[PDB]
């Protein structure tokens, strides 16, 4: 036999509309249509019958859903957006039928995310209601969030050290970088009484999930970029130029629906000849640039 009916969802702007990729578990890349906050979502639900039989139903509806999924558990799923359009009353289907739908000016407050303990995703869900088992079809969507240049973008500049052993001033040109921006910086050496083998700059991603003492932090190290080979002396200046376009980062996400945060840190690491390791971590905000 198979299914008596197959549901497909075709958008009205399906040819012209842009699509975007998502990295999922074990290097998989999905591609879905792309939307932003305030756009209308409209198209058609196409019902393809497959048998010459009849389908008794107690209603057909289409829903636009945005939801946050935590820890791979269905009981922790929270819909932050739900919109319904009823497409048909209780009845029968004997032949193919199509139904229009339009969700007017749809709010989409968060960017889509696929992480470790957290997913945030948007989809269209069509439901054909039946007496004991519904026929359900999901259709996934990417939503981006956009942001213009910030009013204030201060340089990150600091003196740090291990007392009487290593004193350094480091500088990074901004606090806020767009996803295809460049870390321009320098390291300046004030006091050096240790034997430095190499120095690297690391971009660390932290996913923070939960509320209050229920906090799980997942940490991933997305670059290790060597910026110095060998032992400097005092008065030595080391230039940093690190291109972010080589690492495909997600934006900074802060307290999203009061459930999770995704944060980015520059971690400067110096290693001595005996393999001792000296570090300083600094938060950087990553943002998605609106194209002009």
């Amino acid at each position: 036999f198979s299914t008596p009916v197959d549901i497909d969802i075709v958008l009205a702007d399906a040819d012209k509309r842009a699509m975007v990729d998502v990295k999922l578990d074990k290097n998989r890349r999905e591609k879905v249509p792309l939307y932003m906050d305030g756009e209308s979502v409209k198209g058609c639900v196409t019902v393809r019958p497959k048998d010459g039989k009849r389908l008794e139903h107690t209603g057909i509806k289409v829903q636009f859903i945005g939801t946050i999924e935590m820890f791979f558990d269905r009981g922790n799923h929270y819909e932050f957006l739900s919109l319904v359009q009823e497409l048909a009353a209780p009845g029968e289907l004997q032949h193919p039928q199509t139904f229009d739908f339009n969700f007017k000016n749809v709010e989409k407050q968060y960017e889509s995310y696929n992480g470790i303990n957290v997913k945030l995703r948007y989809f269209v869900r069509v439901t054909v209601s039946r007496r004991m088992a519904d026929v359900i079809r999901e259709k996934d969507i990417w939503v981006y969030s956009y942001r213009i240049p910030p009013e204030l973008n201060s340089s990150i500049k600091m003196d740090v050290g291990i007392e009487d052993c290593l004193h350094i001033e480091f500088e990074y040109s901004k606090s806020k970088y767009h996803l295809k921006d460049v870390i321009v910086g320098r390291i300046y050496f004030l006091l050096v009484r240790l034997k430095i083998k190499h120095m690297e700059l690391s971009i660390i991603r932290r996913e923070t999930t939960g509320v209050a003492p229920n906090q799980y932090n997942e940490s991933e190290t997305l670059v290790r970029f060597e910026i110095m080979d060998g032992s400097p002396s005092r008065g030595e200046t080391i230039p940093i130029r690190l291109f972010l376009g080589g690492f495909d980062l997600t934006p900074t996400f802060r307290d999203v629906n009061k459930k999770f945060s995704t944060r980015y840190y520059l971690s400067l690491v110096l290693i001595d000849e005996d393999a001792r390791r000296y570090f300083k971590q600094s938060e950087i905000i990553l943002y998605r640039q609106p194209p002009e």
């Binding site: 036999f1 198979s2 088992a133």
Partner: protein, 349 residues
């Protein structure tokens, strides 16, 4: 993390003779895997624990693979090599399973690898203690196809036994051909006949060392992977069986529902039943539908799982046998190269 699980199986605390004695290995997991607690743990597992464990993996993963175990003593003795095979067999079994995220997720296994007390006490501790043609077609297709592999695998196995057996002589023969020739070489003392004849003796010893080595080189590499497959085929025979149970429950639910429904109607159209008692039967007719709906639904997903396990199974098979062939190539050339180097040595005399 999942494949990035690091495993040394060492420390062959080979409990000394009993004629069945069981090697206990360090299992050091150094693991950056976040599917393994400890960045390092060492446990000291004994053969029995693993075999079970291996079975456990089998048990927690319903069709979802379980490659070959720690090595069998079913041909093994207790040989360092055998135990090594075991060690290896595990290493392998483990290796793969770790680079399969799921089998690596068995909690017993986390505790097992990351705690020494054996699989057992871990295992208490963990449980806190479609159309008719279409399914029937998938069953018969699979039956013919995987019956075909098994027959082939069984035929390759009796070849492996013969191929190991028939390295013992010429090799064993040439070990005495060498002494026979060497003997008469004490009798000649005339320099350019004595000299060659001793080289020719040496040649027979050379043929002996290489011919025999090749049981162990090539045949044995294949015998291990052939055995691994037959077990894996056995294990997915269990997954199948599980699907037949689900098929059994689902029709059972359906014959029970049809009955329940029937009792309901006859009671109704007796026309002499109060709406109280009707409601008791009616409710129970609707619970039977849920029993049909839940039993069918999991039966469908069991078949999604069986498909998935198949597609997986095949994928593993392609890679495994390629490595199988590559390990053979390297060996085949090394056996022949050694004879070439030997043949020149005695061409030069």
């Amino acid at each position: 993390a999942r494949p990035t699980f690091h495993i040394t199986v060492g420390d062959p605390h080979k409990v000394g003779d009993l004629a069945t004695s069981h090697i206990v290995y360090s299992v050091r997991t150094k693991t950056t895997s976040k599917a393994y607690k400890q960045p390092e743990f060492e446990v000291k597992r004994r053969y029995r624990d693993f075999l079970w464990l291996y079975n456990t993996l089998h048990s927690n993963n319903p069709g979802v693979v379980v490659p070959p175990p720690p090595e069998k003593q079913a041909v093994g003795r207790f040989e360092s090599n055998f135990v090594e095979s075991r060690r290896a067999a595990l290493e392998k079994m483990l290796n793969k399973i770790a680079a399969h995220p799921t089998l690596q997720l068995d909690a017993d296994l986390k505790l097992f690898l990351e705690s020494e007390s054996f699989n057992i006490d871990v295992k208490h501790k963990e449980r806190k203690e479609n159309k008719f043609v279409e399914q029937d077609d998938w069953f018969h297709d699979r039956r013919v196809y995987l019956d075909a592999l098994e027959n082939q695998l069984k035929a390759l196995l009796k070849a492996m036994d013969n191929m190991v057996a028939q390295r013992k002589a010429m090799a064993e023969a040439a070990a005495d051909f060498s002494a026979s020739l060497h003997a008469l070489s004490t009798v000649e003392l005339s320099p350019t006949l004595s000299g060659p004849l001793d080289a020719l003796s040496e040649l027979q010893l050379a043929i002996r060392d290489v011919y025999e080595r090749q049981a162990q080189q090539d045949v044995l590499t294949f015998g291990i992977i052939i055995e691994e497959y037959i077990r894996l085929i056995g294990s997915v025979k269990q997954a199948f069986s599980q699907r037949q149970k689900a098929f059994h429950s689902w029709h059972s639910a359906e014959s029970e529902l049809m009955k329940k429904k029937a009792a309901q109607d006859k009671l109704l159209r007796q026309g002499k039943t109060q709406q109280d008692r009707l409601n008791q039967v009616n409710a129970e007719v609707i619970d039977a539908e849920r029993k049909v709906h839940q039993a069918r639904l999991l039966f469908e997903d069991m078949g999604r799982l069986l498909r998935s396990e198949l597609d997986r199974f095949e994928r593993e098979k392609v890679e495994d046998f390629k490595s199988g062939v590559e390990t053979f190539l390297e060996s085949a050339v090394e056996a022949q190269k050694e004879l070439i180097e030997k043949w020149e040595t005695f061409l030069m005399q």
